[PDB]
């Protein structure tokens, strides 16, 4: 709704104020080490976190109620939440993409196959897909109801960042050298596919 | 309490009313008037109205719809779902 | 010019006059502070506007209200009628809509009518 | 111990230090000065007498660098680079003649700079960091030899790579900054991969050096290091200290081991007279040296010798304070 400003800080405060008249609003402390990512459902009820310290964070935003959290294997680098299917993925230090439900505070899948640090990664507005980017110079692609690596491409320069857009359609690529942004097209014609992974170096 | 109504849409239960005030506050109570939400204007100038409103047939959503390019989804509690628009 | 808003409310036949500007936290009536109204047993229903939407919540604001009409009781459903639309009608213009939702949905609940006046129109039915 | 002279090295200004490195077999120190200085001068410990300088006009430097410590080079030369998209040798036979290594082909100028570049154990293999992939280039007749495709994506030019105490050979380390992690890479084969592993970049993302491997020994901005042994890389990738060792209450933006890994020094910038140094394997902490009332400061760079015996602090003063350990 874009009332709201979720902040995270590294001594692992979460701060919550107004966007509409710039105040002081509201106050959580349950990480103790740097609060690596703040998300929150699309009907603003349940309020998800993650810290350095392996722990995931499952919230009332109604209330101040300390609803429920989770201890894993690994600090959590990086969190993007997908909203119209209510879920989230979460990147470990493990080299490993697990994949969490938001309703029921389960753990519901683990992904593995990335050598090296995952760095970007983002759903598909569908829901059905997700494309990370490693310095293994892969861009891989995951679908979620198989639980298999569907594609990777293996590049000449390793990406910064990638973005799906909110239409089914581009794929936005952020590269080290040079300075524009290149954009690639989802084919969204056909497919029947499911098939597999290792291939040429 | 407010602001003259034009469009009024009823729940299939005989429990519910919901009605449309002279804002784009759009607001719901009971039967026995316990005013339960009143909820956020009409937006999408290319003034702001209200002009009619249907209850789901579910019993957990509401369409609003004005004179303003806009169209307005809602549930039973407060949130907004989804605006689509031509 | 400073920021300040004014709604009024009205029992039977008192009426009462409110305004709101930013402040240090006084509630006036007349002369006088908000702890002596007389009848002395109902001083609780003008309590009520303050405790059901928090303690705090006035810390840059001032209230001053007044009275004219009415009997003994009827000035007391007043002027808690007056500083209930006059807190509202605060949070309209400076704090955000977000507060406002908060007290309507607030009042609302406890509602024994915070922000309509009763009116009798008698009938045959 | 003993308490030695105080530093006398003292620039006009309040400036600063580029890095610092030793020598070997005669007590010298030597240093790389932003001024466009290039001096290395007399320690005894009571000595700070200057010996000579280097001054070439037409050139700022703007990054340090110690070449070889043994093929035959050591005594006589030494290559710096700065802003400029080449490399100085400097020739003690004094000849220090510029050798324009501006002969990279097309990969040139596609840094920033080369501002971190390390030699190998016998001068045929130079690396040079990028933004990115590291140059391999023989530093005696001037030609790109080879390069390993570091692959990259964050990489916000890696302030420390060094090969290990275990034989050049056997792989070399590049540490990533922003994120912690280690690259290693097999020298003796380019293109191939002995482990990449996760070290902390939750926390710190700080310069080590080479233990040896015997230990490691890693440190943060949270007063905070802990101990990896070397073949905790294999999986689980991720490794665990035996314990974490807390002694300062601020930041730490030094690190330092000693030549046989049993020491670690820890150091940061932020308040004067703050400086600790933890002993290894016996996992203990040296409180005899240093205090916090002590002249220390706000340290930018620290060096111990190939001995590891003494101390060399450069701070944001001007002063290079040196210290028998």
Redesign the interface.
């Given at each position: 709704?874009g009332?709201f400003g979720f902040i995270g800080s590294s001594n692992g405060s979460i701060t919550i104020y107004?966007m509409?008249?710039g105040?002081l609003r509201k106050k959580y402390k349950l990480h103790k080490?740097?609060v690596?990512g703040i998300s929150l459902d699309?009907?603003?009820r349940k309020m998800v976190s993650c810290g350095?310290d392996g722990i995931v964070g499952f919230y009332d935003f109604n209330k101040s109620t300390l609803l429920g959290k989770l201890k894993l294997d690994?600090?959590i680098?990086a969190m993007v939440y997908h909203r119209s299917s209510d879920l989230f993925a979460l990147a470990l230090?493990?080299?490993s993409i697990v994949v969490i439900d938001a309703v029921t505070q389960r753990v519901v899948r683990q992904l593995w196959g990335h050598?090296?640090?995952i760095?970007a990664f983002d759903f598909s507005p569908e829901g059905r897909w997700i494309v990370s980017?490693?310095?293994?110079?892969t861009i891989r692609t995951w679908d979620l109801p198989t639980g298999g690596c569907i594609d990777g491409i293996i590049v000449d320069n390793?990406?910064?960042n990638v973005k799906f857009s909110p239409n089914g359609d581009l794929l936005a690529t952020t590269h080290?050298?040079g300075n524009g942004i290149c954009i690639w097209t989802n084919r969204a014609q056909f497919k029947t596919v499911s098939t597999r992974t290792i291939d040429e170096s | 309490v407010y602001s003259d109504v034009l469009a009024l849409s009823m729940r299939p239960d005989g429990k519910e009313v919901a009605v449309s005030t002279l804002k784009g506050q759009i607001s719901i109570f009971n039967i026995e008037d316990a005013k339960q939400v009143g909820n956020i204007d009409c937006r999408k100038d290319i003034s702001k109205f209200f002009t009619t409103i249907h209850y789901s047939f579910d019993g957990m959503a509401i369409v609003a719809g004005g004179n303003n390019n806009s169209i307005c989804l809602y549930d039973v509690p407060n949130e907004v779902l989804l605006k689509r628009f031509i | 010019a400073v920021p300040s808003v004014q709604t009024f409310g009205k029992k039977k036949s008192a009426t009462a006059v409110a305004h709101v500007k930013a402040g240090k936290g006084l509630i006036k009536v007349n002369g006088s502070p908000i702890t002596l109204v007389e009848p002395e047993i109902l001083r609780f229903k003008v309590y009520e506007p303050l405790l059901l939407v928090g303690l705090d919540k006035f810390s840059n604001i001032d209230i001053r209200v007044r009275v004219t009409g009415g009997g003994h009781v009827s000035q007391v459903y007043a002027i808690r009628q007056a500083i209930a639309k006059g807190l509202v009608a605060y949070h309209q213009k400076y704090v955000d809509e977000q507060s406002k939702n908060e007290l309507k949905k607030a009042f609302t609940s406890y509602d024994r009518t915070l922000l309509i006046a009763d009116s009798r129109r008698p009938e045959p039915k | 111990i003993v308490r030695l002279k105080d530093a006398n090295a003292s620039h006009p200004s309040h400036s600063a230090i580029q890095s610092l490195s030793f020598h070997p077999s005669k007590p010298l120190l030597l240093t790389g000065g932003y001024d466009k200085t290039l001096r290395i001068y007399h320690i005894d410990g009571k000595t700070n007498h200057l010996v000579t300088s280097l001054h070439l006009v037409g050139s700022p430097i703007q990054t340090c660098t110690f070449y070889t410590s043994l093929s035959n080079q050591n005594q006589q030369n030494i290559f710096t680079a700065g802003r400029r998209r080449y490399m100085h040798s400097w020739d003690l036979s004094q000849t220090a003649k510029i050798e324009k290594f501006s002969r990279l082909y097309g990969h040139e100028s596609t840094q920033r700079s080369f501002e971190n570049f390390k030699v190998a154990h016998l001068q045929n293999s130079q690396t040079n960091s990028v933004h990115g992939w590291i140059n391999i280039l023989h530093s005696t007749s001037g030609l790109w030899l080879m390069g390993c495709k570091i692959e990259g994506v964050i990489t916000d030019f890696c302030i420390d790579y060094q090969p290990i105490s275990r034989g050049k050979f056997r792989t070399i380390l590049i540490a990533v900054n922003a994120y912690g992690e280690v690259w290693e890479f097999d020298l003796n084969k380019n293109g191939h991969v002995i482990r990449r592993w996760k070290d902390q970049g939750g926390v710190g993302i700080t310069k080590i050096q080479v233990g040896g491997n015997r230990w490691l020994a890693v440190g943060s901005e949270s007063g905070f290091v802990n101990l990896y042994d070397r073949n905790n890389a294999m999986t689980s990738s991720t490794p665990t200290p035996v314990a974490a060792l807390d002694q300062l209450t601020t930041t730490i933006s030094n690190l330092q081991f000693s030549p046989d890994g049993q020491i670690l020094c820890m150091a940061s910038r932020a308040v004067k007279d703050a400086l600790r140094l933890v002993h290894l394997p016996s996992c203990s902490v040296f409180s005899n040296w240093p205090t916090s009332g002590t002249p220390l400061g706000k340290v930018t760079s620290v060096a111990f010798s190939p001995s590891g015996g003494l101390l060399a602090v450069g701070n944001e003063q001007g002063k290079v304070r040196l210290w028998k350990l």
């Amino acid at each position: 709704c874009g009332n709201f400003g979720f902040i995270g800080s590294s001594n692992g405060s979460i701060t919550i104020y107004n966007m509409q008249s710039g105040i002081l609003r509201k106050k959580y402390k349950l990480h103790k080490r740097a609060v690596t990512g703040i998300s929150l459902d699309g009907m603003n009820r349940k309020m998800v976190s993650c810290g350095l310290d392996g722990i995931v964070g499952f919230y009332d935003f109604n209330k101040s109620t300390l609803l429920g959290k989770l201890k894993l294997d690994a600090p959590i680098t990086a969190m993007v939440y997908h909203r119209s299917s209510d879920l989230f993925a979460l990147a470990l230090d493990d080299l490993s993409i697990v994949v969490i439900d938001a309703v029921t505070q389960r753990v519901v899948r683990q992904l593995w196959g990335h050598s090296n640090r995952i760095t970007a990664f983002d759903f598909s507005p569908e829901g059905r897909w997700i494309v990370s980017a490693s310095l293994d110079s892969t861009i891989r692609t995951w679908d979620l109801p198989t639980g298999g690596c569907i594609d990777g491409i293996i590049v000449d320069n390793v990406a910064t960042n990638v973005k799906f857009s909110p239409n089914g359609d581009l794929l936005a690529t952020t590269h080290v050298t040079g300075n524009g942004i290149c954009i690639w097209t989802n084919r969204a014609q056909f497919k029947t596919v499911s098939t597999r992974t290792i291939d040429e170096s | 309490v407010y602001s003259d109504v034009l469009a009024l849409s009823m729940r299939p239960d005989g429990k519910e009313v919901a009605v449309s005030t002279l804002k784009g506050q759009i607001s719901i109570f009971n039967i026995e008037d316990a005013k339960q939400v009143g909820n956020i204007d009409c937006r999408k100038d290319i003034s702001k109205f209200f002009t009619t409103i249907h209850y789901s047939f579910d019993g957990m959503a509401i369409v609003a719809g004005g004179n303003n390019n806009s169209i307005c989804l809602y549930d039973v509690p407060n949130e907004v779902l989804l605006k689509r628009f031509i | 010019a400073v920021p300040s808003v004014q709604t009024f409310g009205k029992k039977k036949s008192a009426t009462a006059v409110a305004h709101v500007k930013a402040g240090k936290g006084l509630i006036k009536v007349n002369g006088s502070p908000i702890t002596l109204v007389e009848p002395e047993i109902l001083r609780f229903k003008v309590y009520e506007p303050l405790l059901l939407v928090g303690l705090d919540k006035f810390s840059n604001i001032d209230i001053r209200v007044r009275v004219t009409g009415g009997g003994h009781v009827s000035q007391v459903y007043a002027i808690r009628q007056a500083i209930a639309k006059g807190l509202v009608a605060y949070h309209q213009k400076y704090v955000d809509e977000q507060s406002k939702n908060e007290l309507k949905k607030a009042f609302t609940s406890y509602d024994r009518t915070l922000l309509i006046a009763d009116s009798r129109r008698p009938e045959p039915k | 111990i003993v308490r030695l002279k105080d530093a006398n090295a003292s620039h006009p200004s309040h400036s600063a230090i580029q890095s610092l490195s030793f020598h070997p077999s005669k007590p010298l120190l030597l240093t790389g000065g932003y001024d466009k200085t290039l001096r290395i001068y007399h320690i005894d410990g009571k000595t700070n007498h200057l010996v000579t300088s280097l001054h070439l006009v037409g050139s700022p430097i703007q990054t340090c660098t110690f070449y070889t410590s043994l093929s035959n080079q050591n005594q006589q030369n030494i290559f710096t680079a700065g802003r400029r998209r080449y490399m100085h040798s400097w020739d003690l036979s004094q000849t220090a003649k510029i050798e324009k290594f501006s002969r990279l082909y097309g990969h040139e100028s596609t840094q920033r700079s080369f501002e971190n570049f390390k030699v190998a154990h016998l001068q045929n293999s130079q690396t040079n960091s990028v933004h990115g992939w590291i140059n391999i280039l023989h530093s005696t007749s001037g030609l790109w030899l080879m390069g390993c495709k570091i692959e990259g994506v964050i990489t916000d030019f890696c302030i420390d790579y060094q090969p290990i105490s275990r034989g050049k050979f056997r792989t070399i380390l590049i540490a990533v900054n922003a994120y912690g992690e280690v690259w290693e890479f097999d020298l003796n084969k380019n293109g191939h991969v002995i482990r990449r592993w996760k070290d902390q970049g939750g926390v710190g993302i700080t310069k080590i050096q080479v233990g040896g491997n015997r230990w490691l020994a890693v440190g943060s901005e949270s007063g905070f290091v802990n101990l990896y042994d070397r073949n905790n890389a294999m999986t689980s990738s991720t490794p665990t200290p035996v314990a974490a060792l807390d002694q300062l209450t601020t930041t730490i933006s030094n690190l330092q081991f000693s030549p046989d890994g049993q020491i670690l020094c820890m150091a940061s910038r932020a308040v004067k007279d703050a400086l600790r140094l933890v002993h290894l394997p016996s996992c203990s902490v040296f409180s005899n040296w240093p205090t916090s009332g002590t002249p220390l400061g706000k340290v930018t760079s620290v060096a111990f010798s190939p001995s590891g015996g003494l101390l060399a602090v450069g701070n944001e003063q001007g002063k290079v304070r040196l210290w028998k350990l």
